[PDB]
């Protein structure tokens, strides 16, 4: 909060990705993966 630090940009997924999370309050909720993110393609 402090800046409000709303960090959540689109990032590439080249050949597999390592995600590490430090949490204390169950704040990260999920993940989305795909190509265009506009229902033109199939996304998960």
Resolution of the coordinates, Å: 3.6
Q: Which two tokens stand for residue 12?
A: 């590439």
Which of 40, 38, 42 is CA-nearest to residue 10? 38
For residue 2, give the DSSP letter. -
**Helix, strand or coil, per DSSP, at residue 41:** coil
Give me the sign of the Cα torsion angle 25, 30, 38, 17: positive
Ramachandran sector of residue 42 (left: φ over 0; alpha: ψ -120 to 50; beta: rest) = beta
Q: For residues 20 and 38, what is the distance between their CA atoms, to the nearest angstrom?
A: 27
Residues followed by a gap in the chain, C→N > 2.5 Å:
2
34, 41 contact by CB (below 8 A): yes
Instruction: Name the nearest CA neighbour of 43 among 20, 13, 21.
Output: 13
């Amino acid at each position: 909060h402090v800046t409000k630090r709303f960090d959540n940009p689109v990032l590439p997924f080249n050949d597999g990705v390592y995600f590490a999370s430090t949490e204390k309050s169950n704040i990260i909720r999920g993940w989305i993966f795909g190509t265009t993110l506009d229902s033109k393609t199939q996304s998960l």
